[PDB]
A paper describes a structure:
An intriguing aspect of lymphocyte development is that the generation of a population of self-tolerant immune cells requires Ras activation by two distinct guanine nucleotide exchange factors, Ras guanine nucleotide releasing protein 1 ([name]) and Son-of-Sevenless (SOS). To identify the structural basis for the regulation of [name], we have determined two crystal structures of [name]. [name] is maintained in an autoinhibited, dimeric state, which is released by the coordinated binding of diacylglycerol and calcium second messenger molecules.
We determined a crystal structure of RasGRP1CEC at 3.0 Å resolution. In contrast, the [name] helical hairpin (residues 355–398) in the absence of Ras is rotated ∼15° away from the active site with respect to its orientation in active SOS, which is consistent with an open conformation that is poised to bind to Ras. The regulatory module of [name], containing the EF and C1 domains, interacts extensively with the Cdc25 domain. Metal ions are not present in either EF hand in the crystal structure. An electron density map calculated with phases derived from the model for the four domains of RasGRP1CEC reveals additional electron density for a peptide traversing the Ras binding site in the Cdc25 domain. Clearly, occupation of this site on the Cdc25 domain by the Cdc25-EF linker will prevent Ras binding and nucleotide exchange. An extensive dimer interface is generated at a twofold symmetry axis in the crystal, burying ∼2500 Å2 of surface area between the two subunits in the dimer.
Author numbering:
A (entry chain A), B (entry chain A): 53 to 185, 193 to 436, 449 to 593
Write the structure that this text describes.
């Protein structure tokens, strides 16, 4: 390629970038300097300061009275804005320096220069996808569903989650040394951990008899289908959940059920095993063609190792471009994946159900206590968390909303506002250890507000976020015996035994009043 | 009488006491020096030290080789032991000094002297009442009962409570300046306050309509009957409860119901009113013949005023006997009352019910909150408490026991272990604001353990003493949704949601586990 061994001054890297364009605007046949610089520059300096360098360059060249260097500069900038919009949307300082530059070239007001650097039209066209950027029919019931369907929709989820990660996110993860400041990756983490805990809690959810290990079998089948779908990350998630200490400590279940599977589990462990370092996975992933998913944990370890290996600035005082080239190559290799869409089966109701299923935040100790409570007496997804991910009430409230809307459209049959409690129980099976205190309008029928209650309570326990609809409460002295409409329990005391809602007259303990799940207009 | 103006040395008061006896043992025709000394001596010195004076006297007289002075001393002592046993039972130091004296006269072993001072036989005869020291038929239902019956049984109660107070108790109340060390008076206090609060809570207990003021009328009638029965103390209690600020603040009830009564209430207030000082009550009580009750509050104020007026020891260095005479006269006047038994109607089941009804310990603020909750917007029994009386779990546990046994014998009809919930509700009417969380063996029938539960919970709330049968509890992680067998409410949390009983498998919140009312052998 174009060659820098000891590297080069940042000023000259910029100069080269601009000189890759010509007065007519055409771009050089070899761009890789543009690519590497425009993508990686954020490690040496901020994009604001860089743009400022370009501005000093522009004022200079305009004062030199050369239309060609100005035009080239503007074409370079236009290319920056057009080819990476994301950097501009996310970065505030960059956008403000862009407005500054625009107002500068407008105040000077020389012809086409202004037209070339406009953000407005590009921004307009970017938000311009109103439409997304007869299917098939699947069921929301976990008890009867096929492991391939589960693996498929989990792969859809994981793939979207991955796609959300961008070049600049990897760059940011490299510069900040793993802060949760950058959301996309955190969401992928939540998704992985959530899948693991979903597996573990789903196994523990079933009653003491055989059935738990039947669920075990079913998740191992899901794992197989994930393997054949070449989705390695969620594969690591489900196996990592099946191999966890709390699930591994159930001997009765292990002893109950079949061998072929245990052999398969051995195979999945040995495959996914971390013997230094994940070489089995490295070669497995090597033979994979077309659609694939990275297990981005080890790849991020690779990125970090690369970042720490090479010095950012060289001892010569110049910029080390070997580093920027290497990181660009690795990150580009990763982003490359998101171009190929998954083979199959987009169904968004099941997606809604799973996105809600998979929001789980639990202590290891809690799960050990459940597992131990059920049974009296090492393949690690990590990606080691120095900090655990935390839940966002907005995405979870949307999740519940979408879940309700979907279970409504699918299973209501336009019949009343209700669905049969049998089908509901079957859907509930897909939510481990989920229960909500309520009393029902009809026997064997569930209101929309009632199911919203159930899922809101479920999500409230799962995310460990107490949340509920606002009521106007007033501390009330109850003269006749009365019970909590939230926790279904007696209000103790002589006086001031609870809180009454002014408008709807709902009765609650002080503890239950903030977390009440039902609406005030009852 | 025998005359001391400036009073006399304690040694000489003792000498006189002994000299009132003769060698043959016969007692002087005028004893009042014996009476006053033997009763009141505890204010100048303890009975132990006094007995020790008698012992030095005995050793001295025996060494003087005079059989008459020894015999007289022994006869005096025998009279002390025989005529006041209570002083000897209650006082430990006295009893031990008595054993010392007995072992002394036994070690010297001179004839009859030992026989004369023996405590054993007197003690034997004192405990010797195995029998108490066809009636009539009354009902345990408050809704239909006659004000005269209520006033009658309340008078029985108050009279027993009063009888419990002894000479030495008044003396002790005089010396310690009102410490709750002496129980009998404290019990009378509890009884008065309990009656007041029973009145107030009974009025507040009924629903918002007219009926509360009907109960008001009924208590005013009870008050009238108490007046005609010449029972002034509980009269003061019930009127004092009817005139309380919390009951007086109900205007709707006042406006609802009749005048003749309000005139009568005016009469009861003006009578019982404290205009200095209670002269109306003084003359009312003056015209009273035979059976009467003191309103011992003002009389104790009289005793205190007497005690503070006169100097214990005179400036001459001698004992002021004017004081001892005055206090003896007043206290003797009081004790005199307990000799005449009340005119009527001993029924111990209703007594059991009332003794349990009347154990109440409430904050003024609590009752103000109930009264205020029912109604949105000065004749004082006191006897001012610098310290409020506190409940004793033993007497309350016995109370419940006796209550259950009585409601069992009376209302069961030897039919199953159950009584109808209608009759039970009617009995419950007599316990204001009383409720207990349970579920029942049979619809419309109540177990003996069930009613024991109800009354134990009622008493637990009333006395503000949490109490319950012991279970062996173990902190339990519940895998399936479950509810508190005590508070009838949901057990929150992922893990460690409650406590399970090892033997009977009872489920409870941590808060409910100590206060569980049912037995473990279920
Ligand atoms: Zn509650
Ligand atoms: Zn409300
Ligand atoms: Zn409870
Ligand atoms: Zn038990």
């Amino acid at each position: 390629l174009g060659h820098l061994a000891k590297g080069a001054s940042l000023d000259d890297l910029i100069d080269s970038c601009i000189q890759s364009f010509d007065a007519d605007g055409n771009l050089c046949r070899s761009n890789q300097l543009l690519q590497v610089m425009l993508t990686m520059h954020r490690i040496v300096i901020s994009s604001a300061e860089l743009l400022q360098k370009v501005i000093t360059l522009y004022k200079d060249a305009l004062a030199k009275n050369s239309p060609g260097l100005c035009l080239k500069i503007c074409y370079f900038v236009r290319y920056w804005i057009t080819e990476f919009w994301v950097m501009f949307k996310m970065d505030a300082s960059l956008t403000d320096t862009m407005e500054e530059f625009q107002e500068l070239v407008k105040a000077k007001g020389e012809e086409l220069h202004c037209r070339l650097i406009d953000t407005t039209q590009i921004n307009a066209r970017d938000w311009s996808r109103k439409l997304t950027q007869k299917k098939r029919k699947v069921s929301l019931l976990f008890d009867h569903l096929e492991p391939e369907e589960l693996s498929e929709h989990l792969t859809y989820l994981e793939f979207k989650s991955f796609r959300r990660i961008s070049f600049s996110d990897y760059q940011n993860y490299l510069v900040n040394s793993c802060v949760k400041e950058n959301p996309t990756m955190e969401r992928s983490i939540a998704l992985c951990n959530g899948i693991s805990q979903w597996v573990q809690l789903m196994v523990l959810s079933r009653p003491t008899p055989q059935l738990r290990a039947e669920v075990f079998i079913k998740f191992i089948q899901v794992a197989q289908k994930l393997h054949q779908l070449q989705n390695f990350n969620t594969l690591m998630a489900v196996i990592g959940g099946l191999c966890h200490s709390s699930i591994s400590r159930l001997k009765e279940t292990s002893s109950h059920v079949p061998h072929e599977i245990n052999k398969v589990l051995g195979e999945m462990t040995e495959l996914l095993s971390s013997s230094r370092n994940y070489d089995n996975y490295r070669r497995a992933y090597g033979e994979c063609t077309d659609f694939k998913i990275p297990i981005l944990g080890v790849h991020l370890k690779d990125l970090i190792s690369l970042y720490e290996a090479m010095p950012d600035y060289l001892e010569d005082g110049k910029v080390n471009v070997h580093k920027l080239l290497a990181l660009y190559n690795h990150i580009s290799e990763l982003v490359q994946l998101q171009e190929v869409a998954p083979p199959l089966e987009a169904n968004k109701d099941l997606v809604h159900l799973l996105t809600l299923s998979l929001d789980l935040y639990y202590t290891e100790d809690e799960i050990y206590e459940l597992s131990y409570a059920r049974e009296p007496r090492p393949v690690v997804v990590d990606w080691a968390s120095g900090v655990s991910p935390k839940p966002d009430p907005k995405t979870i409230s949307k999740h519940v909303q979408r879940m309700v809307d979907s279970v409504f459209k699918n299973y209501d049959h336009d019949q009343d506002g209700y669905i049969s409690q049998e089908e509901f129980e079957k859907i509930a099976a897909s939510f481990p250890f989920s229960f909500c205190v309520m009393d029902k309008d009809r026997e064997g029928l569930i209101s929309r507000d009632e199911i919203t209650a159930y899922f809101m309570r479920a999500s409230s326990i799962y995310s460990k976020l107490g949340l509920g609809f606002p009521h106007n409460f007033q501390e009330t002295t109850y003269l006749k015996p009365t019970f909590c409409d939230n926790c279904a329990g007696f209000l103790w005391g002589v006086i001031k035994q609870g809180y009454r809602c002014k408008d709807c007259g709902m009765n609650c303990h002080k503890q239950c009043k903030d977390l009440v799940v039902f609406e005030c207009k009852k």
